[PDB]
Amino acid sequence: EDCKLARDGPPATIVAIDEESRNGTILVDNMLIKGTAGGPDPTIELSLKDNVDYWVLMDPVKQMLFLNSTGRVLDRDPPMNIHSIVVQVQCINKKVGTIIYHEVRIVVRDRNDNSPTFKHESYYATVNELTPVGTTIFTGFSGDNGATDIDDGPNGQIEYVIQYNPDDPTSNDTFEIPLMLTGNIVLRKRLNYEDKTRYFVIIQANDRAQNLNERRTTTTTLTVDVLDGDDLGPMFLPCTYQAAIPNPIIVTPPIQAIDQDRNIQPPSDRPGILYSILVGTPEDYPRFFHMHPRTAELSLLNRDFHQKFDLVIKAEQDNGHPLPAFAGLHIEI
């Protein structure tokens, strides 16, 4: 009869304990095994079996199991991955000679003992100033190239969240993370490179433990650089061109324009200027004037018929963004 379970219920003893419990922690009150080990005339014999690196010790009389973790650590996490522990409690019957193995399964439960950690020390993005609000401009926290958390379940999920930068109070306002779980940054305000070209964006990763009081965090700075877009065309220099006649025709000062965006990258994209005449009076002006369209050099083609010509000059960009600039030119005879 003895050496079989005294309790009702199923024939494994299943129990659970928080990971990171310390030496001596009870694991089973009372196995509750019909019979009595020890005393003067013991009726059963108990011992442990498949107890590797003796994580369990036993008190055969009270039939009670303790953890045995001195010096070592009961870590459910990488790199230990101790999720359960199974051991067997071989009982021998001293009369009848019966030998049973009582299984004891011990379920270690993750705790939120680990914080998020970012793979990189800092992160970094760029964004052309023409980007519309709504645009995702950064996705570097995917690929597990962002924060990680060694813990399991929600103890191991990240929500990313922008934080106020006291050394850049504008950063806060100019970007967001609509989806906390992705941690994609999204442009929230329009930009003028001309005004401000860099943003320091603190992002705070945080795990998602149920008890909000058990929730670890990290932060990182994301440096974001604004890129000069082509939103402006040329401008003449020096910042009404004058000519005279009774060749090529000398023009004071000399017609020169330049793109107004002053830091296009790469230079490969820096466009060129095309000069034309646009309108003029007397209206027969085309009879007498061409202008070379990449250098603005006066082709000439009658004092008492025409005292003077007054023209107006276009310069525009040569990349299907004319964004054109204008300047007069007077010409006496």
Binding of Ca ion by 230 (CB under 5 A)? yes
Site for a copy of itself, residues 183 to 202, rule: CB under 8 A? 188-192, 194-195
- The residue among 50 and 318 lying less far from a copy of itself, judged by its C-beta, is 318
Of 284, 315, 286, the C-alpha closest to 300 is: 286
3-state secondary structure of 268: helix
Task: State the binding string over 147-176 for Ca ion (x if CB under 5 A, else -).
Answer: --x-x---x---------------------
Residue 194's region, left for phi above 0, alpha for psi from -120 to 50, else beta, is: alpha
Pick one of Ca ion, a copy of itself, none as the site partner of residue 132 (Cβ within 5 to 8 A by kind).
Answer: a copy of itself
CB-CB contact of 225 with 196 (8 Å): no
Closest by CA position to 82, among listed 12, 19, 152? 19
77 part of the interface to a copy of itself, by CB under 8 A: no
Q: Which residues on neighbouring strands pair with residue 46, listed in sequence order?
A: 91
Q: How many residues of this chain bind a copy of itself (CB under 8 A)?
A: 19
Phi, psi torsion values for 2, nearest 5 degrees: -50, 155
Q: Which DSSP symbol is given to 171?
A: H
| C-alpha–C-alpha distance, residues 162 and 145, integer Å | 17
To the nearest whole angstrom, how small is the minimum distance from the Cβ of residue 181 to a copy of itself?
8
Write down the least CB distance from residue 290 to Ca ion, Å: 26
Residue 326 binds to a copy of itself (criterion: CB under 8 A): yes
**Binding flags for a copy of itself, 163-182, as an x/- string (CB under 8 A):** ---------------xx---
Strand ranges of the sheet holding 175-176, from the earlier edge strand across to the other edge: 136-138, 185-187, 175-176
Q: Which of 5, 15, 161, 232 forms a contact with a copy of itself (CB under 8 A)?
A: 232
Nearest to 216 by CA among 130, 115, 293, 317: 115
CB 229 within 8 A of CB 130: yes
Stretch that binds a copy of itself, among 132-140, 161-169, 218-226, 245-253 (CB under 8 A): 132-140
Site string for Ca ion, 113-152 (x = CB under 5 A): xx----------------------------------x-x-
Burial 194-204 (b: 16+ CB within 10 A, else e): eeeeebebbbe
261 or 316: whose CB is closer to Ca ion?
261
Q: Identify which of residues 31 and 191 has a Cβ nearer to a copy of itself in the complex.
A: 191
Task: Give the pair of three-digit tokens for residue 66.
Answer: 């303790």
Return residues touching Ca ion (CB under 5 A): 75, 77, 110-114, 149, 151, 155, 207, 228-231, 259, 261
Return residues touching a copy of itself (CB under 8 A): 129, 132-134, 178-179, 188-192, 194-195, 231-232, 323-326
